[PDB]
C-alpha cells in the first residue's frame, strides 16, 4: 500500500483505495468505545511483555488529535497545555497573507504581512494546513535575555534596525462601502 | 510565538544598541527569561534550539510533537557540530559598552507572529467630545470618540480612597454637569 | 468552482488555496458553524438530582 | 426564540483562522451556564476534536 | 522527489546503532 500510494497520481491510487482495501477504517466515538487501539505498531504491537496483544486498530499518527491552529505549534508536547491553548487562540490573530487574491478582496479589515516566512521548524501536519504557502510570521533571531528590562513582564525588545529593514512590517486595509 | 508566549514590544533598540555574538548577530526580539519558568513553554526553548540547527544545517527541522526521533540531546549534538554551544547559549557582548555579558545568552531563530492587536488601533483619549442624546454623558467607545467608563468598582475604589472631591468630579462634573 | 483548475480559479480571481465551505450572502462570507446536539433515536438514562425522579430514560 | 450565531462571518484575518473557522464546532449549551462538565475536555474527544483549540473566554 | 530520496536514505540511516542516549532524553510507556 505504501509503495502504491507513493506513486499516487502517477498510478491514480488514492486514499479511497486504502479504504476500499480494508486497510483503514472510519471509527466513530461510539465504536471507539469498543476498539482496542494501539498507538504506533513498533511501540505497541511488538513482543514486549504484552500489555494486551489484542489491538484491533492503530492510530495513524497521534498528532492527528490536534486541530488546525494547534498543529502549527512545534513540540506542543513540550509545553504546558494552557499555553498550547493560548497559541491556538493567538494563531487565529497572527498577521500573514490571509489569501492570495487579497488584492481583489474588499474585506472590511485585512492585515497582510510584508515578508511572512515559512517556519524554520514545522510540524508535518502544517504541510496539509498549507502553512508554508500562506504563512503567518517571521523566523527571528530571538534572544532570551533580561538585558535592559524593557522586556520584563511579558514584553519583548525588538530590533529597531530589523524593523527598518521590514521586520514584521505589515499593511492594514480598511474597506468603506457606500451605495 | 507559537508557544503562547505573548508580549508587547516594550522598546526598540537599533542594531548598534542590541547585544551581539562574536559575529555581529544581534537578536531581533529579546524576551525576558521570566516568561519561561512559570509557564514551562519548553517547546519554545526546543524550537529555538532546533531552529538554530535548521538554519545552520540548512533545512527545516521537524517539530512534530510525538516524534521520538527528535529529542533535545540529539539536537544539541547536531548544534555542537556547527561550532555553537550545544545548548544554544552564546556569549553576547553588551551593545552599549561592548563588554561580554557574564551570563551566556540563549539565542536562536524562533518563529514569531505579529498579532492584529496593534496599539494605534487601541490608543484612545477624550476631553469633552460628543455626548449621548438621552443622558448627556460621553458616548461609548473609541470609534464614537467616547469616554471611558468610570464604573461602579472605580466608585468603590475612590470611596475607599475617601477621595470625595475626585469622586464628585468623575461621577458628575466631568460627565453630566447640569442644573 | 467545482473541480475547477488552479489556472481557471486564478482567472476567476479566486484563490486555489481557498477552502470553500462558506456561503456568500449579500457579499459576506458566512460559515455555518456545526451545532452539537444530543443524538436522536438513542435512549439515554440520566439521574437528575434535585427532582422527584431517581432516574429518567430520555429519548 | 430561535438559535443565534449559527452563521458567522468567515474569519479572513489569517489563513489558519479561515481554516479553523470552517472546522469549528459549537455546543449550544448556555454560556453563563455555570456548569463545568460541558466545558471540560471529555476523554471521548480524542482524535475527534482538538484538545487545545478552544476560546479561553466565556465560550 | 529528491526529498523522497533523501528520506529513504535517512530511513536506512535509521538502522545505525547508538543514535540514542541513556540519559533519558525521552521516555515512552511499555506497561504490562
Amino acid at each position: 500500500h505504501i509503495d502504491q500510494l507513493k506513486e499516487r497520481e502517477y498510478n491514480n491510487y488514492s486514499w479511497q483505495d486504502l479504504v476500499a482495501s480494508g486497510v483503514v477504517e472510519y471509527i466513530d466515538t461510539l465504536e471507539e468505545e469498543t476498539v482496542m487501539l494501539a498507538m504506533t505498531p513498533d511501540d505497541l504491537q511488538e513482543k514486549e511483555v504484552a500489555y494486551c496483544s489484542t489491538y484491533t486498530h492503530c492510530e495513524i499518527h497521534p498528532s492527528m488529535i490536534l486541530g488546525v491552529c494547534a498543529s502549527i505549534i512545534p513540540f506542543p508536547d513540550h509545553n504546558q497545555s494552557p499555553r498550547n491553548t493560548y497559541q491556538s487562540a493567538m494563531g487565529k490573530q497572527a498577521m500573514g497573507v490571509y489569501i492570495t487574491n487579497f488584492h481583489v478582496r474588499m474585506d472590511t479589515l485585512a492585515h497582510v504581512l510584508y515578508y511572512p516566512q515559512k517556519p524554520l521548524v514545522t510540524t508535518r501536519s502544517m504541510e496539509y494546513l498549507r502553512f508554508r504557502e500562506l504563512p503567518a510570521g517571521i523566523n527571528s533571531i530571538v534572544a532570551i535575555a533580561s538585558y535592559t528590562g524593557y522586556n520584563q513582564e511579558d514584553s519583548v525588545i525588538m530590533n529597531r534596525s530589523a524593523v527598518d529593514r521590514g521586520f514584521f512590517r505589515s499593511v492594514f486595509y480598511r474597506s468603506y462601502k457606500e451605495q | 510565538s507559537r508557544h503562547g508566549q505573548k508580549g508587547t514590544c516594550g522598546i526598540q533598540y537599533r542594531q548598534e544598541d542590541m547585544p551581539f555574538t562574536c559575529e555581529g548577530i544581534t537578536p531581533d526580539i529579546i524576551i525576558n527569561p521570566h516568561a519561561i519558568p512559570s509557564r514551562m513553554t519548553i517547546g519554545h526553548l526546543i524550537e529555538c534550539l532546533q531552529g538554530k540547527v535548521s538554519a545552520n544545517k540548512g533545512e527545516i527541522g521537524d517539530a512534530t510533537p510525538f516524534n521520538d526521533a527528535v529529542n533535545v540531546q540529539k539536537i544539541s549534538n547536531l548544534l555542537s557540530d556547527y561550532g555553537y554551544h550545544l545548548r544554544g547559549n552564546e556569549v553576547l557582548y553588551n551593545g552599549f559598552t561592548g563588554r561580554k555579558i557574564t551570563s551566556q545568552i540563549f539565542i536562536g531563530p524562533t518563529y514569531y507572529q505579529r498579532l492584529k492587536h496593534m496599539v494605534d488601533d487601541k490608543i484612545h483619549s477624550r476631553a469633552r467630545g460628543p455626548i449621548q442624546i438621552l443622558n448627556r454623558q460621553p458616548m461609548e467607545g473609541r470609534s464614537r470618540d467616547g469616554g471611558l467608563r468610570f464604573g461602579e468598582m472605580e466608585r468603590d475604589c475612590q470611596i475607599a480612597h475617601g477621595a470625595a472631591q475626585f469622586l464628585r468630579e468623575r461621577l458628575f462634573e466631568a460627565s453630566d454637569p447640569y442644573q | 468552482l467545482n473541480g475547477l483548475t488552479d489556472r481557471d480559479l486564478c482567472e476567476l480571481n479566486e484563490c486555489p488555496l481557498d477552502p470553500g465551505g462558506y456561503f456568500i450572502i449579500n457579499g459576506s462570507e458566512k460559515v455555518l458553524i456545526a451545532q452539537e446536539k444530543m443524538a436522536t433515536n438513542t435512549v439515554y438514562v440520566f439521574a437528575k438530582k434535585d427532582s422527584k425522579y431517581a432516574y429518567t430514560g430520555e429519548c | 426564540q430561535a438559535r443565534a450565531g449559527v452563521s458567522q462571518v468567515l474569519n479572513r484575518l489569517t489563513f489558519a483562522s479561515t481554516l479553523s473557522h470552517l472546522r469549528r464546532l459549537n455546543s449550544p449549551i448556555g454560556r453563563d451556564g455555570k456548569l463545568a462538565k460541558p466545558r471540560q475536555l471529555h476523554n471521548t474527544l480524542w482524535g475527534m476534536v482538538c484538545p487545545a483549540e478552544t476560546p479561553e473566554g466565556h465560550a | 522527489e529528491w526529498n523522497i530520496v533523501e528520506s529513504e536514505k535517512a530511513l536506512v540511516a535509521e538502522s545505525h546503532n547508538m543514535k540514542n542516549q541513556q540519559m533519558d532524553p525521552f521516555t515512552r510507556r511499555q506497561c504490562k
Partner: peptide
C-alpha cells in the same frame, strides 16, 4: 511485506493521501 519500522515515512504517505482525497473542509 510489513513495514519494518522505518514507518514514519509510510505513516505520512498515508495522511498525505488522505488530505489529497479529503481537503480540510470536506465535512462542510
Amino acid at each position: 511485506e510489513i513495514t519494518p519500522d522505518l514507518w514514519q515515512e509510510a505513516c505520512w504517505i498515508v495522511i498525505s493521501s488522505y488530505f489529497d482525497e479529503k481537503g480540510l473542509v470536506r465535512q462542510q
